[PDB]
Write an enzyme that holds these catalytic residues in place. Structure first.
Site, PDB file in Angstrom:
ATOM      1  N   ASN A   1      33.124  37.520  38.156  1.00 33.68           N
ATOM      2  CA  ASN A   1      34.311  36.700  38.337  1.00 33.68           C
ATOM      3  C   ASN A   1      34.356  36.024  39.697  1.00 33.68           C
ATOM      4  O   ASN A   1      35.249  35.206  39.937  1.00 33.68           O
ATOM      5  CB  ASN A   1      35.577  37.544  38.156  1.00 33.68           C
ATOM      6  CG  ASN A   1      35.759  38.024  36.731  1.00 33.68           C
ATOM      7  OD1 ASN A   1      34.867  38.642  36.152  1.00 33.68           O
ATOM      8  ND2 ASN A   1      36.917  37.730  36.154  1.00 33.68           N
TER       9      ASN A   1
ATOM     10  N   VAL B   1      37.653  32.813  43.357  1.00 37.48           N
ATOM     11  CA  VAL B   1      38.062  34.094  42.795  1.00 37.48           C
ATOM     12  C   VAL B   1      38.669  33.843  41.422  1.00 37.48           C
ATOM     13  O   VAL B   1      39.537  32.974  41.269  1.00 37.48           O
ATOM     14  CB  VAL B   1      39.058  34.810  43.718  1.00 37.48           C
ATOM     15  CG1 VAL B   1      39.260  36.241  43.275  1.00 37.48           C
ATOM     16  CG2 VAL B   1      38.574  34.756  45.161  1.00 37.48           C
ATOM     17  N   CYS B   2      38.212  34.597  40.423  1.00 40.96           N
ATOM     18  CA  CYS B   2      38.706  34.465  39.056  1.00 40.96           C
ATOM     19  C   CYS B   2      39.486  35.720  38.682  1.00 40.96           C
ATOM     20  O   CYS B   2      38.902  36.712  38.233  1.00 40.96           O
ATOM     21  CB  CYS B   2      37.556  34.231  38.081  1.00 40.96           C
ATOM     22  SG  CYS B   2      36.986  32.523  37.992  1.00 40.96           S
ATOM     23  N   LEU B   3      40.803  35.675  38.865  1.00 38.96           N
ATOM     24  CA  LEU B   3      41.687  36.759  38.468  1.00 38.96           C
ATOM     25  C   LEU B   3      42.791  36.204  37.584  1.00 38.96           C
ATOM     26  O   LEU B   3      43.332  35.129  37.855  1.00 38.96           O
ATOM     27  CB  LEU B   3      42.298  37.469  39.680  1.00 38.96           C
ATOM     28  CG  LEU B   3      41.581  38.744  40.123  1.00 38.96           C
ATOM     29  CD1 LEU B   3      40.214  38.409  40.673  1.00 38.96           C
ATOM     30  CD2 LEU B   3      42.403  39.500  41.156  1.00 38.96           C
TER      31      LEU B   3
END
Ligand SMILES: O=P(O)(O)O[C@H]1[C@H](OP(=O)(O)O)[C@@H](OP(=O)(O)O)[C@H](OP(=O)(O)O)[C@@H](OP(=O)(O)O)[C@H]1OP(=O)(O)O
Ligand SMILES: Nc1ncnc2c1ncn2[C@@H]1O[C@H](COP(=O)(O)OP(=O)(O)OP(=O)(O)O)[C@@H](O)[C@H]1O
Lengths: 293, 1012
Positions: A137, A144-146
């Site tokens: 991610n 940032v992949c959240l």
């Protein structure tokens, strides 16, 4: 555990602090003292600040100053500009028993003008010149992949929530999801290859590469190029924890030796093991060179 | 043919049929006051086939305050008013055949010639001959629609009469509703349950039709009258004999014409059907009816209007009103104050009230020739009453004529108030039709004409268009592509040379706040907005709230409209409005499961913008980020994770080099959109696949689509391919000619084109109704190596030059025809409609929905502008809170509702202290004054201790932040580090809540003056 006691006692005073990060000239334009990512976004930010933004930040400040997770496995260190809260920088050590373990990772965070209506911008700074996608991610440029950031797919409860979500929740989620001992299957599709011999084999490959990259950047390049925002803190941390890393590197070297015989991924593990042993020797040199602040 | 390029907005209001009847109509108007003038204006803007005006009077200097076509020359020549201004009226619309007449009207005048007209409107007319004309009108076969209106001082009258019976073809312009059927039973009467989450939103007695109903196949095409049981259920009559119910079904609203009955004017003198606009005074309209009848009787008896302040005339009018009230059916109490004010202002004229009544009258006239909406039945009265009582009891000399063009207004509001208006400084934002009407009202009212003080400022960033000409009457075709504000201001001085006005081409926004600083706002007195979006409204509201100035706003959509009034220390802000946000179509519904044609149009618009704006921007930004394709190839060969490179390579491998290849790519895109996607989704979801309960997945609202087979001979396919090929050629800069678009040439191009066969895939479908567009699934190494091969071959084939790294980005033009965006979107939407077996849509509704075009009409803008002028007069008066009246309206019904503005609330901060949105606290100090001194000064003056200080975007002091006790000792200038531009600074301070752990309660902004 006297080491644990001293570890907790010392960095408790260091987990939160203010630090002027932007020097200011005469005409109201920002002169940034150290490295940061949102140069143009901050400089072009509107001066019509919403009051609710500042009030929410102030309310958060109490919890963010009193309840930072502190443990030898992992700890959080918090710095912001002495005159602006929306400029943000955070440092985290890797949780134990992970390929990320004890590695120091610096983040750039900016709270948007509409915050808390939108999640704050989050970014990786220990990218080593954007060399490695350290987490599935976590892109090589640092993005940032959240789901809590709305930057990853998820159900509404996983999404950002202006009324309930907190910056501390994001901080905890970093450790709980990104900073795990199991990064490889986190890639969509690989979680289905979890358990499969090919999937686990590629997981070993990815985690060995991540281990050697962490040894290179997060430890060796971090100590050899200390960051001003935590320069004394990182050196004290490394002095305290160094006894663990001098064995962690050896156990990782021993592990990759078992992998190297493999004809599919052990061939790449050979290159990663060469890099790992070189960086381990250099890291031991630096540990011998490391003083106590 | 309707000139759509001029009339699109009017089409979106009225409908084509109404205008088709309108193109065969002749309308006559009698009396040429300001009211008749504006009636002619609105009708000619609407585009009547033929209008005939009449006037037996001649120009006077007194008319200059009520007319904006007259000049001093016309009064000097003593020309007939209508015939003098006839030439000017013709400028408004060349299509309208405008004629004039001056035949004297009296008791012996023959009315037989009037039969050529469909509707006749009377102004400035004696009541008995109005009775005679009305008698003639309704006695015709078919009866001529009769409308009359009057304006006298601050009072107005409007009456309608369409004979014994008139047919309304459509009660309201609301789109008929369609509702999915969840349940329906075989019962006497049968009971129908709609979708459990979707409200029924219908009423008993309405007529419905049914389609796609499973179980009762016989109900398809049947029509029933309904009876509401619940907001989710109802009954439709006996259904016991029907076959059993299975699932599905859709109910579609059915519209029915309604007959409306009108009495004669004389018979309506008693028991008049009066519309009510203020529920707090459900009797005032009848009192005004009595007062107007008394005034008419006085004019009959004395051949003159009452004199201002004439006690004899006022007493005579009181006696007449008392007598008339006794003859009335209901005999209401005569309002002495209203009669007194009527006698006081009988000879005067008020133009904004005329503007409102003229707008509503023109809308009624439009109804009379179309039957498109339910009309007024039969009376409506508008007042400017609140102004006069706020002045107490003034003297008659306040209103006596003084020789200027403003004598008419002086007799109504008084000289001192007129001087106040002349002195005002006004900032106006937006040059829409609302702005144009407001400027015309200002010019006729003498607003800002003081040679010393009065000053008007308006601004707008856009230029004039032909479409704007339909309602922005100030402009002409030879003003197209010219500044709206400049042309409007230039034309304004022709109406009134005494006006002093300034104009700008500026968009009001935070970036332009430098021009419009606080000092500029302080220079102004009233700020009025004619914006078309909410964000600009909020920005202007915040600025005016900070600068403590009144703000006026008005919203206009179709026949609906409203007026917002904001006054310092009195009312709420516009930001106080917190209407619910629009809920958008579910992402799964839009991409995969559409049921409405609006879903397909939205999908087409999004696909268009992605294909022609977004992805082109990505491509060009990629080639700006990276110098050469060779560089990207080297980086990806070393495993660099660049972004969008895969899509750029895919575009380059798909890049055509000639028109034929562009047509080929367009055909491939057609195949992908309308055949392959269906096969994929059906592979994932068979037509008979079922859910957990065993119910079919393909059930309401989920429509199972059917793949489309291509045929160039289909006009829809031809249009789609032509538009797609044109847009793609523009994309890749491939030149072409119109002959390349010919169907035979396209067939020749596609003759050698091989249609690729479909193959299925197992992509997961986001069926969640709460889903959203996520990030991409990680790309496999197969696509990586395929793209690598693609750009390697491109480089080897020299397709790596800068031109190969260049391609056009297209803006979403919506008005012109040649750009083909509208045609492309319509073709795609109709193909998607046939795709899911949904009914197609026409080009113009596609243009409306895709362009977010707000329907507009001259009647609504005139009506709202008159009101706005009224409350700005009230604001100039400095009147108490009660005088200010917000208003909402919907001419479709028609309906007008007045309501007092929302009272400003008090925010109880702590310990009984409260403050308003208009509150800003002040502190005075000195250079050695410190932060601790600041806290002490606040805790002393306002009795509350500050807990947190903010310097704009910077923080100033927080107790929990490290080392901030020292900041208490620092002086204001040292810690602020301010510029010498101000003698003060503004800060934000909150206070600790009553319960710990809660956020600090925000206080009002505070201004610390550096001196005392
Ligand atoms: O990215 P979008 O414009 O929103 O639409 C995409 C796009 O289709 P177009 O190429 O016609 O624009 C994809 O293609 P690429 O962008 O990768 O070229 C395609 O994916 P495939 O090429 O793999 O078919 C995908 O279709 P899907 O989501 O069914 O895989 C489709 O989505 P929509 O047309 O439904 O938005
Ligand atoms: N921030 C702003 N500052 C100044 N003028 C503005 C601003 N926002 C909008 N306007 C103006 O408001 C006007 C609104 O008038 P109108 O209803 O005719 O809108 P439009 O967009 O011109 O019309 P249409 O919807 O028919 O295309 C526009 O002419 C636009 O230029």
């Amino acid at each position: 555990k006297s080491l644990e006691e001293k570890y907790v006692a010392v960095m408790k005073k260091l987990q939160f602090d203010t630090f002027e990060m932007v020097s200011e000239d005469e005409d109201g334009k920002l002169g940034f003292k150290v490295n940061y990512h949102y140069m143009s976004q901050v400089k072009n930010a509107n001066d019509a600040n919403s009051a609710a933004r500042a009030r929410r930040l102030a309310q958060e400040a109490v919890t963010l100053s009193t309840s930072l997770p502190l443990s030898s496995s992992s700890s959080v260190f918090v710095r912001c500009d002495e005159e602006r809260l929306d400029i943000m920088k955070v440092l985290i050590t890797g949780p134990a028993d992970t390929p990320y373990a004890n590695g120091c990772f610096e983040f750039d965070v900016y709270f948007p003008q509409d915050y808390p209506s939108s999640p704050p911008l989050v970014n990786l700074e220990t990218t080593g010149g954007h060399s490695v996608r350290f987490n599935p991610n976590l892109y090589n440029d640092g993005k940032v992949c959240l789901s809590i950031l709305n930057t990853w797919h998820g159900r509404p409860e996983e999404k950002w929530n202006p009324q309930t979500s907190s910056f501390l929740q994001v901080l905890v989620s970093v450790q709980s999801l990104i900073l795990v001992a199991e990064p490889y299957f986190n890639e969509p599709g690989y979680e289905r290859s979890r358990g499969t011999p090919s999937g686990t084999q590629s997981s070993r490959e990815y985690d060995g590469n991540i281990r050697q990259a962490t040894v290179k950047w997060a430890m060796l390049e971090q100590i050899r190029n200390p960051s001003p925002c935590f320069k004394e803190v990182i050196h004290k941390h490394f002095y305290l924890k160094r006894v663990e890393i001098m064995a962690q590197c050896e156990e990782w070297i021993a592990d990759i030796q078992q992998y190297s015989s493999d004809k599919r991924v052990g061939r790449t593990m050979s290159h990663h093991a060469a890099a790992l042993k070189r960086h381990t020797a250099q890291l031991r040199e630096e540990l011998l060179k490391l003083p106590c602040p | 043919e309707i000139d759509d390029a001029l009339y699109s907005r009017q089409r979106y209001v009225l409908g084509d049929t109404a205008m088709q009847k309108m193109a065969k109509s002749h309308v006559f108007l009698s009396g040429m006051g300001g009211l008749g003038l504006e009636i002619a204006k609105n009708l000619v803007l609407a585009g009547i086939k033929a209008v005939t005006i009449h006037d037996t009077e001649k120009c006077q200097a007194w008319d200059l305050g009520t007319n904006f076509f007259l000049s001093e020359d016309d009064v000097v020549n003593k020309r007939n008013r209508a015939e003098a201004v006839l030439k000017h009226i013709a400028e408004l619309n060349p299509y309208v055949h405008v004629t004039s007449s001056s035949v004297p009207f009296n008791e012996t005048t023959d009315l037989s010639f009037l039969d050529k007209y469909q509707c006749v409107v009377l102004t400035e007319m004696k009541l008995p001959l109005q009775k005679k004309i009305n008698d003639f009108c309704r006695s015709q076969c078919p009866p001529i629609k009769f409308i009359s209106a009057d304006v006298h001082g601050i009072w107005s009258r409007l009456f309608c009469d369409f004979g014994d019976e008139f047919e309304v073809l459509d009660t309201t312009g609301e789109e008929p509703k369609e509702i999915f059927i969840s349940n329906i039973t075989q019962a006497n009467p049968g009971i129908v349950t709609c979708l459990e989450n979707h409200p029924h939103k219908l009423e008993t007695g309405q007529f419905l039709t049914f389609r796609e109903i499973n179980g009762m196949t016989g109900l398809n095409g049947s029509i029933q009258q309904i009876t509401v049981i619940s907001p989710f259920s109802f009954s439709i009559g006996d259904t016991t004999e029907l076959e059993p119910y299975l699932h599905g079904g859709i109910a579609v609203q059915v519209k029915t014409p309604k007959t409306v009955f009108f009495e004669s004017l004389e018979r309506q003198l008693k028991h008049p059907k009066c519309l009510i606009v203020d529920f707090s005074n459900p009797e005032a309209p009848l009192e005004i009816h009595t007062a107007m009848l008394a005034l008419d009787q006085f004019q009959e008896k004395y051949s003159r209007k009452p004199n201002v302040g004439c006690q004899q005339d006022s007493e005579e009018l009181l006696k007449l009103a008392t007598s008339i009230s006794e003859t009335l059916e209901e005999k209401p109490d005569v309002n002495a104050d209203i009669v007194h004010w009527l006698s006081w202002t009988a000879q005067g004229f008020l133009s904004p009230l005329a503007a409102a009544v003229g707008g509503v009258a023109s809308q009624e006239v439009l109804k009379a020739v179309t039957g498109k909406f339910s009309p007024l039945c039969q009376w409506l009265y508008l007042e400017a009453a609140d102004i006069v009582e706020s002045l107490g009891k003034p003297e008659c000399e306040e209103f006596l004529p003084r020789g200027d063009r403003y004598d008419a207004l002086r007799a109504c509001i008084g000289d001192t108030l007129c001087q106040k208006l002349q002195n005002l400084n006004i900032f106006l934002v937006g040059c829409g039709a609302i702005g144009c009407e407001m400027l015309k009202n200002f010019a006729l009212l003498g607003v800002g004409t003081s040679k010393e003080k009065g000053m008007i400022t308006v601004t707008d960033p856009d230029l004039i268009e032909k479409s704007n000409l339909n309602r922005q009457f100030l402009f002409r075709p030879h003003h197209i592509q010219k500044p709206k504000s400049y042309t409007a201001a230039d034309a304004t001085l022709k109406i009134n040379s005494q006006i002093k006005i300034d104009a700008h081409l500026n968009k009001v926004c935070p970036t332009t706040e430098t021009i419009y600083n606080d000092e500029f706002y302080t220079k102004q007195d009233v700020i009025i907005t004619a914006l078309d979006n909410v964000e600009a409204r909020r920005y202007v509201d915040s600025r005016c709230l900070a600068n403590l100035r009144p703000l006026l706003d008005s919203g206009t959509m179709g026949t609906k409209g409203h007026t917002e009034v904001i006054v310092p220390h009195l009312t709420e802000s516009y930001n106080s409005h917190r209407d619910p946000p629009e809920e958008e179509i579910p992402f799964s519904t839009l991409k995969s499961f559409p049921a409405a044609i609006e879903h397909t149009i939205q999908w087409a618009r999004d696909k268009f913008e992605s294909s022609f704006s977004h992805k082109p921007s990505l491509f060009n930004k990629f080639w700006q980020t990276y110098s050469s394709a060779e560089e990207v190839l080297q980086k990806i060969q070393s495993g660099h994770s660049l972004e969008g490179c895969f899509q750029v390579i895919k575009l380059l491998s798909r890049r055509p080099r000639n028109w034929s290849q562009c047509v080929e790519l367009a055909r491939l895109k057609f195949e992908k959109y309308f055949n392959h996607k269906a096969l994929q989704l059906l592979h994932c979801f068979p037509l008979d696949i079922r859910l957990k309960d065993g119910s079919l997945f393909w059930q309401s609202p989920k429509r199972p689509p059917s793949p489309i087979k291509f045929d160039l001979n289909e006009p829809l396919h031809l249009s789609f391919l032509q538009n797609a090929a044109k847009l793609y050629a523009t994309v890749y800069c491939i030149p072409f000619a119109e002959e390349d678009l010919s169907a035979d040439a396209l067939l020749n191009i596609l003759s050698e084109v091989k249609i690729q066969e479909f193959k299925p895939s197992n992509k997961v479908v986001q069926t969640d109704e709460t889903a959203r567009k996520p990030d991409h699934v990680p790309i496999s190494s197969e696509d990586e190596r395929n793209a690598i091969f693609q750009l390697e071959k491109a480089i080897l084939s020299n397709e790596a030059t800068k031109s190969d790294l260049q391609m056009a980005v297209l803006s979403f033009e919506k008005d012109d025809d040649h750009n083909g965006h509208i045609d492309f979107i319509t073709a795609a939407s109709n193909l998607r409609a046939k795709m899911y077996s949904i009914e197609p849509a026409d080009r113009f509704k596609t243009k409306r929905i895709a362009g977010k075009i707000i329907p507009a009409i001259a009647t609504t803008t005139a009506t709202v502008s008159g009101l706005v002028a009224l409350e700005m007069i009230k604001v100039t008066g400095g009147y108490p809170f009660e005088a200010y009246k917000n208003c909402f309206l919907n001419l479709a019904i028609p309906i007008v509702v007045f309501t007092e503005t929302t009272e400003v609330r008090k925010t109880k901060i702590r310990n009984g202290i409260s403050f308003t949105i208009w509150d800003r606290w002040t502190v005075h100090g000195k250079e050695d004054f410190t932060l601790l001194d600041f806290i002490n000064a606040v805790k002393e003056k306002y009795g509350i201790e500050p807990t947190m200080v903010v310097q704009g975007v910077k923080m100033l002091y927080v107790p929990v932040m490290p080392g901030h006790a020292k900041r208490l000792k620092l002086t204001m200038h040292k810690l602020v580090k301010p510029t010498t531009e101000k003698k003060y600074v503004d800060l934000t301070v909150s206070f600790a809540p009553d319960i710990d752990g809660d956020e600090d309660l925000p206080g009002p902004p505070v201004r610390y003056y550096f001196s005392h």
